[PDB]
Amino acid sequence: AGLLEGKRILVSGIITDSSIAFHIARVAQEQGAQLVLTGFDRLRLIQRITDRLPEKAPLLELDVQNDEHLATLADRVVEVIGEGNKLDGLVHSIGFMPQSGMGINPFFDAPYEDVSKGIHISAYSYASMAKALLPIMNRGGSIVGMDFDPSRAMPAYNWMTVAKSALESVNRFVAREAGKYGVRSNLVAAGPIRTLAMAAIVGGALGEEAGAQIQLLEEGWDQRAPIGWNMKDPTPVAKTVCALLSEWLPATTGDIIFADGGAHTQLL
Amino acid sequence: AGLLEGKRILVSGIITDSSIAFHIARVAQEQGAQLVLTGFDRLRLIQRITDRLPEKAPLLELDVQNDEHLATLADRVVEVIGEGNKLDGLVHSIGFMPQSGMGINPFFDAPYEDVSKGIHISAYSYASMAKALLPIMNRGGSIVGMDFDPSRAMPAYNWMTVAKSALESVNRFVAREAGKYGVRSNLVAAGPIRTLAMAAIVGGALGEEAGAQIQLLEEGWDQRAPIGWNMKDPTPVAKTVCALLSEWLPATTGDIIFADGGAHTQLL
Amino acid sequence: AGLLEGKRILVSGIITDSSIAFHIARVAQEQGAQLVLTGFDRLRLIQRITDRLPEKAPLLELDVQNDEHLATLADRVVEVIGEGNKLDGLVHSIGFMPQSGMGINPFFDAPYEDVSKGIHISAYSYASMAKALLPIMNRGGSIVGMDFDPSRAMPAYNWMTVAKSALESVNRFVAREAGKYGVRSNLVAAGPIRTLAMAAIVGGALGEEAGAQIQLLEEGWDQRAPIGWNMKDPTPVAKTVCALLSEWLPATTGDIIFADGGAHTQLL
Amino acid sequence: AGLLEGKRILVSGIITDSSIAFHIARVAQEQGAQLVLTGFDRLRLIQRITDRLPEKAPLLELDVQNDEHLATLADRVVEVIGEGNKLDGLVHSIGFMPQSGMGINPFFDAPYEDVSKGIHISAYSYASMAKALLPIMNRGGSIVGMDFDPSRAMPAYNWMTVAKSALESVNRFVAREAGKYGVRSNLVAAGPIRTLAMAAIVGGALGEEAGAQIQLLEEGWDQRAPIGWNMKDPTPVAKTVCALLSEWLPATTGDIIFADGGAHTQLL
Incomplete structure (x- = not known):
């Protein structure tokens, strides 16, 4: 019997097998959970990736910018988990900022049209997925979103930092709504992880001043972290999310749990 | 000789004479500053209000959602302050959220179209005004924006809280850009002030559960504040903004100064 | 197989069966851990209390103000857990402030002799127990201390708040030392719990202005908490400590996990 | 007429002319204030230093660990400022940690006797000086203490960091007491300043791993600071203290104002 034995958990954000x-x-599957996965725009390609998970899982279409997708999401989840069953967990792991909003592009040069798209997908969608799925979540359930500590500004991350600040605020309000259902809402602030998306930004900064800053920024995490930080090892972050999905943090909500090696508690 | 003697300061956000x-x-005028004011959509009506200031001041049109207005703002400021002169200060006091995003309306029921408009006007515009005006600001200058502490969620303020969280993050990045010009960027987190806009929200909540919560929320500020809090007295907040516009906090930037009676430092 | 199956954990702070x-x-015992308990001054009486735990556990004398007790603690733990075995966990749950430092007594009237004793027992001892026991803790181990959020001042808690602020700082430095051993160090900031010690303070404030403030303070936790707060139910806090003692938060150190119903994320 | 024209301000902490x-x-004297200075143990030598100030000022003996000195302090201040006059400001700039508590000495090797002395002088004395002097402070007055941001741990600063965390908590409680008198209480968190005391620690770390860490730590402040940081230039910090002593931040209390170049708002 695993940490999440029999728990029904919807997991968004699987783009590649480097995705958090x-x-x-x-x-979660290693710990006994039964998953429902979401994706958009690349469904056949996503299924090839999710086939590499230990267990099978239904894959549902979800464009969080599509009101009709959100309006039917709960009904479509019930179709695959069965009448009279509800979700025990919701994992929000979708974060996106157009290219103008990150990397070597100057902070002032991002048009609001791009910033708005990034905040829609990265922050507002945390509330709209909670709105859609709380009516079919079980008391004692858990909503978890992915965060990257935006309390201090930093090179290159730029408007994505702003979107994460917005997400942290949204999480505190989602917690107020989720509490009416006996459901917790929290974020996991991870250290840097080498996803293909972040690698594309870092790679596109090679030889530029932003790339020098990014290198110093990344190297600082492992240095600051009293237990180190491995950007190529997402498992400690995944375990932390599963901790919040379990019932072992039953009095924590509206909150932020740091899975960053302790880096954010140290100046050097 | 006053605190801001001879300083040229652009001030946005004058809607009524209850506006902060x-x-x-x-x-600022009592302290010797020479002002340039901005407004949009009600220019003749705004001039009737700004006539009630102690000294005359030019009034320039600025819709922060209008790219052409921003593209010409610096040129139009120079037209009124004179060739070869620059601004010493910039006051950002524009905050707006459509009705769906505040008050008695449920948090989950605000469409993103409304939230996006509010974040554009309340947060992104802090960066785009800095982008427009830093090229004509003097070394040692000061950009100040208005904040309302969003670190903890609260009833009724809803998506405006999210917009302020975004603004705090934007301020930290504006500080990085402003530093290249020898210019500071800070926010003043004020306690609640009875503007006509906030009074309209509070008034529209009378008799509803949100209005009960708002009353308890407002009454808590004066209680928590070790020196009290008067929602009808904006002068302590105005003095604090002028402190940041002066050169008496010359090593503070990217930061948040609280003008709230100390309420945020106390639980009860 | 439980969450802490086979883990050897030293637990301090058992005064009564209302102690956290x-x-x-x-x-921890329900989850399969093998415990070593500590106490001072009332050892026969403490054993009568610890007899009421589900499983037997050795009880060792530890006055944290006694240098000789600390100098021999590791040797005495090894005596009971066996040659070649080490601890996987350390729970610091000792907090004490003389009567002058809490309750109805004015903040300014606590002599430093009393404040110093409280900070010795409540904060410095977290470092000195880590100093004594890290040499006999296993890689991947976990040190957990109990906290009460001191980021904002509050009535009655007075110098105990100051001692908790000191403890949070000590924890960040213990994390730097513990990291050299592959050991994490964290605090759990709990909501208010009705221990006999806290009840004695609250009871001694009945009819006084501090007691009125304490009542409003306590009632605010359950109100603010989106999932509520029960001061008579320490189990959610105990589960949270066990979460940190497990390996399900393996990238968290130097940190503070809130087990408070989410109260600290909400203003009202 | 200067920023503090005619204000009577007691200033502690003058050890050398490198002292903040x-x-x-x-x-303060350049801004028109009338000062009362304190010192202990080196009074003739301190007077030779304070002679180098622009204006004369009485020098009073104050060992903050001496209860009799504190019991008579208000009477002795009145003796020099005159019957019926009161102080408008109080500057707490005393910070001390024995050698075992900082620098190259291991964190775990500081005996509590040393840590306690440091916390007495660096943190508790902020409350006991407020206790002594609030009865002779004017409504609208201001108490300011010196801070060094302890929210994240760092090399070498060690137990002095713990003492500053304690001081920040004490400040929030002093603000509650000071508010009854119409008096504000705040701290200024400065960037690193090359006093003779800090230089002795840095100098004693030359060639050691702590000295390498200290160098990287100091160099990071100017790098992180969007407006830079000069450790040899204490004037921006002094101006910030004078800002808080004035009436230009009249709604700020229990709080922390950062005079650090903005370094603490930036990760890199």
Whole structure:
């Protein structure tokens, strides 16, 4: 019997097998959970990736910018988990910022049209997925979103930092709504993880001043972290998400749990 | 000789004579500053209000959602302050959230179209005004924006809280850009102030559960504040903004100064 | 197989069966841990209390103000857990402030002799127990201390708040030392719990202005908490400590996990 | 007419002319304040230093660990400022930690006897000086203490960091007491300043791993600071203290104002 034995958990954000959500899903399945996965735009390709998980899982279409997708999401989840059954967990691992909003592009040069798209997908969608799925979540359930500590500004991350600040605020309000259902809402602030998306930004900064800053920024995490930080090892972050999905943190909500090696508690 | 003697300061956000920006402008003029004011959509009506300031000041049109207005703002400021002169200060006091995003309306029922408009006007515009005006600001200058502490969620303020969280993050990045010009960027987190806009929200909540919560929320500020809090007295907040516009906090930037009676430092 | 199956965990702070440490110990044993308990001054009486735990556990004398007790603690733990075995966990649940430092007594009237004793027992001892026991802790181990959020001042808690602020700082430095051993160090910031010690303070404030403030303070936790707060139910806090003692938060150190119903994330 | 024209301000902490308090005193006098200075143990030598201030000022003996000195302090201040006059400001700039508590000495090797002395002088004395002097402070007055941001641990600063965490908590409680008198209480968190005391620690770490860490730590402040940081220039910090002593931040209390170049708002 695993940490999440029999728990029904919806997991968003699986883009490649380097996605944090891929490893969250893997660990959750290793711990006995029954998953429902979401994706958009690349469904056949996503299924080829999710086939590499230890267990099978239904894959549902969800464009969080599509009101009709959100309006039918709960009904479509019930179709695959069965009449009279509800979700015990919801994992929000979708974060996106157009290219103008990150990397080597100057902070002032991101048009609001791009920033708005990023905040829609990265922050507002945490509330709209909770709105859609709380009516079919079980008392004692858990909503977990992925965060990257935006309390201090930093090179390159730029408007994605702003979107994470917005997400942290949204999480505190989602917690107020989720509490009416006996459901917790929390974020996991992870250290840097080498996803293909982040690698594309870092790679596109090679030889530029932003890339020098990014290198110093990344190297600082492992240095600051009293237990170190491995950007190529997403498993400690996935385990932390599963901790919040379990009932072992039953009095924590509206909150932020740091899975960052302790880096954010140290100046050097 | 006053605190801001001879300093040229652009002040946005004067809607009525209850606006915080009205009192910022008044105190700045009492302290010797030469002001440039901005407004949109009600220019003849705004001039009738700004006539009630102690000193005359040019009034320039600025819709922060209008790219052309922003593209010409610096040129139009130079037209009124004179060739070869620059601004010493910039006051951002524009905050707006459509009705769906505040008050008695449920948090989950605000469409993103409304939230996005509020974040554009309340948070992104802090960066786009800095982008427009830093090229004509003097070394040692000061950009100040108005904040309402969003670190903890609260009834009724809803998506405006999210917009303020975004603004705090934007301020930290504006500080990085402003530093290249020798310019500071800070926010003043004020206690609640009875503007006509906030009074309309509070008034529209009378008899509803949100209005009960708002009353308890407001009454808590004066109780928590070790020196009290008067929601009808914006002068302590205006003086604090003028402190940041002066050169008496010359090593503070990217930061948040609380003008709230100390309420946020006390639980009860 | 439980969450802490076979883990050897030292638990301090069991004074009565209302002590948080009593419930931490109970849940840890329910989850398969093998405990070593500490106490001072009332050893026969403490054994009568610890007899009421589900499983037997050795009880060792430890006055944290006694240098000789600390100098021999590791040797005495090895005597009871066996040659070649080490601890996997350390629970610090000792907090004490003389009567002058809490309750109805004015903040300014606590002599430093009393404040110093409280900070010795409540904060410095977290470092000195880590100093004594890290040499006999296993890689992947976990040190957990009990906290009460001191980020904002509050009535009655007075110098105990100051001692908790000191403890939070000590924890961040203990994490730097513990990391060299592959050991994490964290605090759990709990909501208010009706221990006999806290009840004695609250009871001694009945009819006084501090007691009125304490009542409003306590009632605010359950109100603010989106999932509520029960001061008579220490189990959610005990489960949270066990979460940190497990390996399900393996990238968290130097940190503070809130087991408070989410109260600290909400203003009202 | 200067920022503090005619204000009577007591200034503690002048050890050498590199002391932050020396520059606070100088700027305050440049701004028209009338000062009362305190010192202990080196009074003839301190007078030779305070002679180098722009204006004369009485020097009073104050060992903050001496209860009799504190019991008579208000009477002795009145003796020099005159019957019926009161103080408008109080500057606390005394910070001390025995050698075992900082620098290259291991964190775990500081005996509590040393830590306790440091916390007495660095943190508790902020409350006991407020207790002594609030009865002779004017409504609208201001108490300011010196801080060094202890929210994240760092090399070498060790137990002095713990003492500053304690001080920040004490400040929030002093604000509750000071509010009854119409008096504000705040701290200024400065960036690193090359006092003779800090230089002795840094100098004693030359060639050791702690000295390498200290160098990286110091160099990071100017790098992180969007407006830079000069450790040899205490004037920006002194001006910030004078800002809080004035009436230009009249709604700020129990709080922390950062005079650090903005370094603490940036990760890199």
